[PDB]
């Protein structure tokens, strides 16, 4: 319908947005290293954990972009990893949560970014991209439409954001040059541009400025429908309680949340964050979702 109050239902917040709006133009909360929630070993948690809750908790809190990092096993299935570590979560496991969620909330869409996080186990029969495409993508939940995907065509389906090469099947967002630890801008699909801020290995200070500056560039280019803006608030670092992603996010999330709160912008972009929870105020994911009041 037509009320900003509808953006307040985290489970169906995309319901009020017009079908004609390109997904790119929508401000969307996302989660970084989404599948790390099962990590229980203290040392592993410090070095790799970025989320405390599962996929379903994540989507019921408004997150629509999932950063999935896989690895081809001998058994010829794709499981989730954080570098060399297996996360006790599988790709099927993710797809099924997304399927259930999209069934209960058919107004929504889920964007799934897929990246090959580690090298294929030695005995696999096919390549990573090939297994993914013949064994999973082929599933009807995957949108096979490319171009500047519109919200209308996406609802009820999972939209792929390829972060792997060798893709032979058309659909979703195509792979694009993604340089290490920087903020950049290039082109995707056919004519659309993309600017990404992914300075994952920098100082806190440099990070907050990188986020704000990319966010500024976004709110100032609010009507450029064919421009993707992906902005990672996540930052990784050393191995101690005052250096871990949890420590940083406990600062970065409320800081960016308020930053959006006060600027009252029309466009915020795709904001991928660590630790989507309900501890810090204001809520980053909620402020990002509210920057959509202008589309209603």
Ligand X SMILES: N[C@H]1[C@@H](O[C@H]2[C@H](O)[C@H](O)[C@H](O)[C@@H](O)[C@@H]2O)O[C@H](CO)[C@@H](O)[C@@H]1O
Q: Which of residues 141-200 bind ligand X (CB under 6 A)?
A: 180, 198, 200
SS3 80: strand
For the record, the structure tokens of 212 come out as: 């704000």
287 binds ligand X (CB under 6 A): no
10 binds ligand X (CB under 6 A): no
- Residue with smaller CB distance to ligand X, 82 or 290: 82
Structure tokens at 118: 């580690």
Q: Which stretch binds ligand X (CB under 6 A): 12-20, 38-46, 210-218, 228-236?
A: 228-236
Per the structure block, which two tokens stand in for 18?
A: 């017009």
What amino acid positions are annotated as catalytic residues?
A: 32, 82
**In the complex, minimum distance from the CB of residue 41 to ligand X, in angstroms, rounded to a whole number:** 19
Interface with ligand X (CB under 6 A), residue total 7
Per residue in 120-149, is it b (16+ CB within 10 Å) or e — as a string?
beeebeeebbbbbbeebbeeebbbeeeebb
Binding flag, residue 223, ligand X (CB under 6 A): no
**Min CB(288)–ligand X separation in Å:** 17
**Residues in CB range of 220: below 8 A, 6 or more apart:** none
* 274 part of the interface to ligand X, by CB under 6 A: no
Q: Is 98 helix (H, G, I), strand (E, B) or coil?
A: helix
Alpha carbons 121 and 140: distance in angstroms, whole number:
28
Near ligand X by CB under 6 A, which window of 166-174, 209-217, 232-240, 282-290?
232-240
User: Is 232 a residue that touches ligand X (CB under 6 A)?
Assistant: yes
Minimum separation from the CB atom of position 264 to ligand X (A)? 28
Residue 26 to residues 15, 56, 155, 174, 178: CA-CA distances in angstroms?
12, 21, 13, 19, 22
Residues 26-85, interacting with ligand X (CB under 6 A) = 32
Q: Where do contacts with ligand X occur on this chain (CB under 6 A)? A: 32, 180, 198, 200, 232, 234, 236
């Amino acid at each position: 319908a037509s009320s900003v109050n509808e953006l307040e239902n985290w489970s169906k917040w995309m319901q009020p947005i017009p079908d004609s709006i390109p997904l790119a133009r929508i401000s969307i909360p996302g989660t970084h290293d989404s599948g790390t929630f099962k990590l229980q070993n203290p040392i592993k948690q410090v070095w790799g954990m970025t989320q405390e809750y599962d996929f379903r908790y994540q989507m019921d809190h408004g997150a629509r972009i999932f950063d999935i990092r896989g690895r081809l096993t001998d058994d010829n299935t794709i499981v989730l990893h954080h570098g060399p570590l297996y996360l006790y979560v599988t790709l099927h496991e993710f797809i099924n949560e997304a399927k259930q969620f999209l069934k209960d909330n058919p107004s929504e869409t889920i964007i799934m970014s897929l990246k090959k996080e580690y090298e294929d186990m030695k005995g696999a029969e096919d390549s990573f991209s090939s297994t993914f495409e013949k064994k999973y993508f082929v599933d009807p939940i995957f949108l096979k439409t490319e171009g500047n995907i519109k919200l209308g065509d996406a609802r009820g389906k999972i939209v792929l954001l390829k972060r792997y090469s060798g893709s032979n099947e058309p659909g979703g967002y195509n792979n694009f040059y993604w340089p290490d630890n920087e903020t950049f801008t290039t082109t995707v699909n056919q004519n659309a541009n993309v600017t990404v801020q992914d300075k994952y290995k920098v100082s806190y200070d440099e990070k907050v400025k990188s986020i704000k500056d990319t966010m500024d560039e976004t709110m100032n280019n609010s009507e450029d429908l064919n421009h993707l803006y992906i902005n990672f608030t996540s930052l990784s670092s050393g191995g101690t309680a005052w250096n871990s992603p949890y420590y940083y996010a406990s600062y970065i999330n409320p800081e960016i949340a308020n930053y959006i709160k006060q600027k009252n912008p029309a466009r915020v972009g795709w904001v991928i964050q660590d630790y989507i929870n309900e501890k810090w105020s204001p809520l980053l994911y909620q402020e990002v979702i509210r920057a959509n009041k202008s589309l209603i």
